[PDB]
Amino acid sequence: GAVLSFHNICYRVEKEILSNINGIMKPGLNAILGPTGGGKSSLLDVLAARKDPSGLSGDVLINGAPRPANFKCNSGYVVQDDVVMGTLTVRENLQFSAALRLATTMTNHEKNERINRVIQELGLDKVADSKVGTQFIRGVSGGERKRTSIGMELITDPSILFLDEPTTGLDSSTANAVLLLLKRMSKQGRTIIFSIHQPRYSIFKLFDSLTLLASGRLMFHGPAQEALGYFESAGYHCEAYNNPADFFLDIINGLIEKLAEIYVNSSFYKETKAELHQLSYTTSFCHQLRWVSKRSFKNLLGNPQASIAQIIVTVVLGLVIGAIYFGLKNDSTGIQNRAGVLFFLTTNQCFSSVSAVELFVVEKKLFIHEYISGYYRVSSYFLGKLLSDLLPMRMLPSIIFTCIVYFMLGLKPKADAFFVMMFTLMMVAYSASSMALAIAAGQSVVSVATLLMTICFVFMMIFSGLLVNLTTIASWLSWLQYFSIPRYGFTALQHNEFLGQNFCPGLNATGNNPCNYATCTGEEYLVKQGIDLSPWGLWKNHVALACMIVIFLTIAYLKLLFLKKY
Amino acid sequence: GAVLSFHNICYRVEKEILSNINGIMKPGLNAILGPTGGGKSSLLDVLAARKDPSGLSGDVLINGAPRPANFKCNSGYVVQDDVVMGTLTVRENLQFSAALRLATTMTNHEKNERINRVIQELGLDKVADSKVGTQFIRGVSGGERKRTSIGMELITDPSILFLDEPTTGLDSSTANAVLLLLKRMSKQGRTIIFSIHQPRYSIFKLFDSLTLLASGRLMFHGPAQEALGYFESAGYHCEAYNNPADFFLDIINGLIEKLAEIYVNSSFYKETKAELHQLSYTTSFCHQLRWVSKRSFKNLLGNPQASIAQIIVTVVLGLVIGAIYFGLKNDSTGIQNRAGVLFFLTTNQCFSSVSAVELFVVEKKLFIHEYISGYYRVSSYFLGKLLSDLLPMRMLPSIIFTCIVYFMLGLKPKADAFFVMMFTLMMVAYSASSMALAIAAGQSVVSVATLLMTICFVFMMIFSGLLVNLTTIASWLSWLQYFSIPRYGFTALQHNEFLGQNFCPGLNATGNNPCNYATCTGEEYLVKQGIDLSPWGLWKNHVALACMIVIFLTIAYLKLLFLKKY
Amino acid sequence: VQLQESGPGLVKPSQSLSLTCTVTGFSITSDYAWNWIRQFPGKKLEWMGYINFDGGTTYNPSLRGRISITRDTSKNQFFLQLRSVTPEDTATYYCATFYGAKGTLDYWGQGTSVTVSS
Amino acid sequence: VQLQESGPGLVKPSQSLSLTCTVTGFSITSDYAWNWIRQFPGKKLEWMGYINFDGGTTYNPSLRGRISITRDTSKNQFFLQLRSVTPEDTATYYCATFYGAKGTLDYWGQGTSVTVSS
Amino acid sequence: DIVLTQSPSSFSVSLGDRVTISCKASGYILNRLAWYQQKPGNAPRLLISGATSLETGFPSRFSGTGSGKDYTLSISSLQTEDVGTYYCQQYWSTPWTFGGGTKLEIR
Amino acid sequence: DIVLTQSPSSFSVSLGDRVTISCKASGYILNRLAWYQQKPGNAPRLLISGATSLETGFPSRFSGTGSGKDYTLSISSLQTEDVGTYYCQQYWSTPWTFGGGTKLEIR
Ligand SMILES: COc1ccc2c3c([nH]c2c1)[C@H](CC(C)C)N1C(=O)[C@H](Cc2ccccc2)NC(=O)[C@@H]1C3
Ligand SMILES: COc1ccc2c3c([nH]c2c1)[C@H](CC(C)C)N1C(=O)[C@H](Cc2ccccc2)NC(=O)[C@@H]1C3
Ligand SMILES: CC(C)CCC[C@@H](C)[C@H]1CC[C@H]2[C@@H]3CC=C4C[C@@H](O)CC[C@]4(C)[C@H]3CC[C@]12C
Ligand SMILES: CC(C)CCC[C@@H](C)[C@H]1CC[C@H]2[C@@H]3CC=C4C[C@@H](O)CC[C@]4(C)[C@H]3CC[C@]12C
Ligand SMILES: CC(C)CCC[C@@H](C)[C@H]1CC[C@H]2[C@@H]3CC=C4C[C@@H](O)CC[C@]4(C)[C@H]3CC[C@]12C
Ligand SMILES: CC(C)CCC[C@@H](C)[C@H]1CC[C@H]2[C@@H]3CC=C4C[C@@H](O)CC[C@]4(C)[C@H]3CC[C@]12C
Ligand SMILES: CC(C)CCC[C@@H](C)[C@H]1CC[C@H]2[C@@H]3CC=C4C[C@@H](O)CC[C@]4(C)[C@H]3CC[C@]12C
Ligand SMILES: CC(C)CCC[C@@H](C)[C@H]1CC[C@H]2[C@@H]3CC=C4C[C@@H](O)CC[C@]4(C)[C@H]3CC[C@]12C
């Protein structure tokens, strides 16, 4: 089959974490053992090309030739923490993987046949149409989840298959079933490379090669059965009823340089060195966008707790606000009530958008894994995520809010005013969400992002135009009002509502105001707040919000593009 | 030493999770093994009296007598997840435990000598004065943390010592060191009972007794060395290089009723049954309050990230608000600016108090463990926590806010007004924090509590008196304004500020107002909002806030008192 | 500036009462608010409602749904309709004017008596 | 109701200009706001500031720190002080009254000429 | 709503005497108070607005004072043309309410 | 601040003619505009307030109109006593500002 050989590998990150290491991994089960920080995982990443080539200082060859550019696309890699979509079924996950990884020339029938073959091979036919783990709906067993992860990487029929801790977190019987399946797959001529953690003898007997690493150094590389003999010849006795893997780890724990020199002075080292010296996008943009959006939307529907909670909160807020403000009046209290309700609606659209920091943070590991494997470009992933999760969920609350409250309150009864209000609330929601994405994209934890979002929104709320009267602020500070998302929305809503209204019953101030301090019309109130009375004074707010949306989405895209994905 | 015997135990919770189980545990290492859900942990809790006596249906005797009332006080219990205070040192944790568990008649010198003995026995003299694990400061190793947990339970010199998974989460060498220490302690005549998870042969050889449980049933009880012989006589062969514990678990996994009957039909069962048939506050309230408050305050100082973040946010908000509102004026815009800034200060005191849901949630497991062990009463714990964490941290922001903004803004320049403002902001902070405690006390997770707090505060903010004008609300809804914490604070601040002010330059409306709609004095503004002009109209707000504080703190105390602590 | 009520002086119970005020010397669409006030026997005054110069209305809450005030700007008139009447609605009815910059009821009508009997 | 300015008609540069307005027929502590206005040669008017009936002041921002207005309620007078004067402060100075319910400058003084030279 | 209470429902006086009528509001009114005089067979006629300002067409014998919740109408040297009924009215809040009325009588 | 601009600095007319003077505000003023007439050797004298209301003591030959940012002062049948300088003033915002003035002249 395929023979992976690594010669004189050195990896430095500038500390060195992988010293001189060399070996050969042939078809069959090849295992890597050692302490948690020893370097089994680092070696696995280096051999899989999942690491930046800066630190690499060695030679890797497959069948005696250097690794080609499309190596990551032609070799499967199974991650330790499963990244299968829980809200989908086994066949759905396999269909997504097959759609994005296999060439599009193949018909849908051929892809379905290949998926059928893979399902049969891994023995998933019982659960072929079951949701794989929801945490709101019960899912299949952990062994079936791991088998699904293996199946997604087997769709493209790889020659080399990497696994990272394929047994950690599983039960003993499940672990044995997993490794027996791996053993069956290895006999077919498939090269399987994996790292394990504290195996058992039942597990240990199945290997064909063993590579022991500790503190970045090669303690032993050779056939698995001969490790015990090597360590006995080193001068260590094996007690009965003792697991050999536990024996090797006990030897390592208790020096390391001594065992390293001993291995170099061994015959296996000479044979390996002699052999080493002897040897020396698939799919379109639209296709990826469609499938990314489809999977994201299915995940949104299948895990609806958060979305339902947001919609219920929106409806309850709408009904309560409609009851509290029912029947606005054109008297001394009309200005206060109108300004208060519009201010609340705008700042609510801002504060309820801080949950958009979780759009890209929750799926970061899945994104990096699938980008490395060549599923899609960053552009199509970004646009599909925006089109499926951001677009409808930030659009529904605006429609619900206006439809509920507009006629309970008795806002301006024209159709243009109704639709301008709905559109303005939508634009505020999109701008706030885009700012949250720009701040949070490409990060692993949301705590600092959430704190920054909340502080920024509190400062923007103060500059909206209700709490401080923007015309009174000092000039060296006043320019900060142009960075306020709520200010543009609040200004547009006030312009839409207050124009042409009277608030002093019995007193007609449209012609002239008799007393100088009365504030009897909507125009007087708007000008006192610093708001322009022309139609451009309405629409420049929407121009500003649109420009903010574009800028923030571009920043989020760039932060995803230049993210270190390794 | 002390002999713990359990006869015909049945535990039902009404599913039964512990079927007929009986045995005897003598001095030396006694271990309990089995699957995760098998019942090793349930048996350990039942034998330690850490479970409600409702489900218990058996007999437990120590040296042939029933367990006395003060059994939990005289027997140490080491929890799986360590509960040692990270911000303290080893000697500090031991001093706290010794102060609350040993009788107060002993001098401080005797307690210090006992702590010295315990430190020597566990070999912690190297790290006797080091912070035990901070997550903001590097701490001692996991083995030393576990040894500290064991030391806290050894202060009172117990005869019986329970441990729950004393090796889970540790390294192999650390696990061996821990169990060797346990073996040394057991030879001194101390009865040690513990449950383990997948031990090694090096671990397994150290036991003196073994009790195997699976699916609530007793698979085997007898000397540890004879388990292999029993299972061989059952008809199961042991392969070489196999850990016996893994062998027993493999037997169990593969029926259970068959092995249960086999064990009943064994000679060990007969011997155990024959033996069983043969057999059949320390400190004052003030002391506890002082020490609880001392430890809580040290923990607050030693882990200051959150407190520093809150103070920095407060100072930045204060300076920015002072700059934005600098120099309030007595003109048409004076009313809007004064009302806006006071509204922001009050609602900020409410929203920044939702982080008080973490006062009792974070330390729930520590509270339950220490309450069961008889460290303190719930009253002294509750009061010490209030006196150390709630009292100063909710007092600082009010002082900082008033001191910074009062003279930048130019609020009323009397001393009484300054101190009334400071006191009012303090009362708002305490009321909001008390409501958060009442909602969150006695719970494990804060998500639902945080959601309820935020929704309640948003509804209270709408009823404060700026966004809706309380005199205009319909009668069947208007009564809801009496539940609003921000409303009382905002009313008091407005009463304090607006009385005696003019806002129409050139127009003297103190005598009479020439035009009917002008709003030229602070009295007119206050009456339009529904606020009483008498001095009682100021102080009834503080009466309401004080009553709310008392009611909410009483609810929080009751929820801690009737919490199921088992 | 000059107001005058008119309408039927007798109403049967459960019927509807209708009155008219004709304004001369000022345009009801120009400035003020235009009110209806009644005085019971055993003299006590009750304000009922007004119609504003721009057509908005405001009513006394003690007359829920029973009162409507409308206007006819071509002939400078505003109207009162009080429906489902009872003998407790026996009173003298006045129309009056309210400025608003001042706040008081400056000009009154003559008053018309309405009896609700059978 | 009746106002009259008085003060020195000549000031040397960098000195301080001081003027007085005496009010008769009305109490300056009673109702209005009390203003200073100047007219340059090449007639252009500039409002400088006022003192309110309760003692508060408001100044034109173009005169930063250079202007103070004070009062003496016992003799019904208010004062102007313009410090660090330059020859560009040559003008006729008026005191005027501002009602506030109306908004206009109703009563003016006679005006006094001030020259800044050497 | 705001309830207005006049203390005496009736008041006996003689010519040239001094009369004082009192009105109490249940809430703060802030000088938004008016007085009306009604002769028999006529509509009420506005007498004082703003609690102090006297309407043109009435002698200076009438004056009004008050603040807060308590207001008074004062007649010095009562004459024959002053006999009638007097009502206070608040116009601070939109359900405008009248007092019960005080009927002056001659002894 | 708000800048007020009068279009002509000077204007030649004859007796009995009709004169119109224009003022432009840089911001919305909402009829908070006044006109002053100044004879030589005298203080300015208020002529119109509220952009429309004429002061007592002036003939009905003067009238003012406007809205938004554009206001005009109109004299029909100019007479000899009307020659002088006219200023507009805004009192909407606290730095009150005058226009440059328009000097009427006789041909
Ligand atoms: C109208 O006057 C308001 C309106 C609205 C808020 C909010 C706060 N003050 C307010 C005052 C504070 C933020 C301050 C301390 C800068 N605030 C909070 O502290 C909580 C808790 C929080 C804090 C930081 C990060 C994550 C959560 N979250 C919030 O959104 C609210 C919004
Ligand atoms: C002045 O007008 C305001 C002032 C203030 C807020 C806040 C919100 N609307 C507001 C509108 C929302 C709460 C709504 C959706 C009920 N709001 C939020 O959503 C974030 C996120 C959040 C949501 C629920 C639980 C925990 C966190 N947290 C907050 O405190 C803010 C406060
Ligand atoms: C509220 C008023 C006074 C202005 C406050 C808004 C300013 C301070 C906010 C608006 C948008 C914000 C930016 C949005 C996006 C990013 C990209 C991120 O990777 C670092 C922070 C950075 C660069 C933010 C810095 C702070 C910022 C510029
Ligand atoms: C750089 C990052 C943090 C975003 C900052 C960009 C913001 C501050 C920019 C983007 C688009 C800009 C707006 C573009 C168009 C107009 C219309 C103009 O007649 C007034 C300014 C106004 C309203 C601008 C204000 C500032 C603005 C909103
Ligand atoms: C105009 C308002 C309503 C918002 C519209 C902005 C949207 C359509 C814009 C803002 C940022 C843009 C992205 C910015 C950069 C790129 C890189 C390019 O190689 C593919 C498209 C992609 C990913 C753009 C797609 C369109 C995009 C998402
Ligand atoms: C409508 C606005 C003005 C006020 C709304 C506040 C109401 C809904 C709030 C105020 C205090 C709150 C209570 C505070 C404490 C407790 C005890 C806890 O174990 C369950 C929730 C419960 C019972 C809360 C229910 C909600 C509650 C009653
Ligand atoms: C049931 C739980 C949530 C506590 C709710 C209790 C609240 C609603 C109670 C506790 C104390 C009460 C206050 C006690 C005293 C006064 C003074 C009185 O002249 C007006 C009512 C007022 C201001 C009460 C309003 C209602 C009040 C604030
Ligand atoms: C300062 C004002 C406004 C409020 C002060 C209220 C505080 C001090 C009150 C409110 C609730 C009270 C607690 C309620 C119940 C008990 C149980 C009793 O066995 C010991 C006292 C203890 C624990 C009280 C201590 C004092 C306490 C915490």
Author numbering:
A (entry chain B), B (entry chain A): 34 to 46, 60 to 300, 328 to 353, 369 to 654
C (entry chain F), D (entry chain D): 2 to 119
E (entry chain E), F (entry chain C): 1 to 107
Text taken from the publication that reported this structure:
It is constitutively expressed in membranes of numerous tissues and tissue barriers, including the liver, the kidney, or the blood-brain barrier.
The observed conformations of ABCG2 bound to Ko143 (2), MZ29 (3), and AZ99 (7) are similar and resemble those previously reported for MZ29 (3) at lower resolution and for ABCG2 bound to the tariquidar derivative MB136.12 In contrast, the structure of ABCG2 bound to MZ82 (6) revealed differences both in the conformation and in the pose of the two copies of the inhibitor. The two MZ82 (6) molecules are rotated ∼15° relative to Ko143 (2), MZ29 (3), and AZ99 (7), resulting in a shape that resembles more of a “rectangular wedge” rather than a “triangular wedge”. The TMDs of MZ82-bound ABCG2 adopt a more closed conformation than those observed in the structures containing Ko143 (2), MZ29 (3), or AZ99 (7). Transmembrane helices TM1 and TM5 are shifted by 2–3 Å toward the opposite TMD, resulting in partial closure of the binding cavity. The resulting conformation is intermediate between a fully inward-open state and the ‘Turnover-1’ state, but without bound ATP (green cartoon). Of the four inhibitors tested, MZ82 (6) was the least potent, with an estimated IC50 of ∼23 nM. On the other hand, it captures ABCG2 in an intermediate conformation between a fully inward-open and the previously observed ‘Turnover-1’ state, which is thought to represent an early stage of a productive transport cycle.
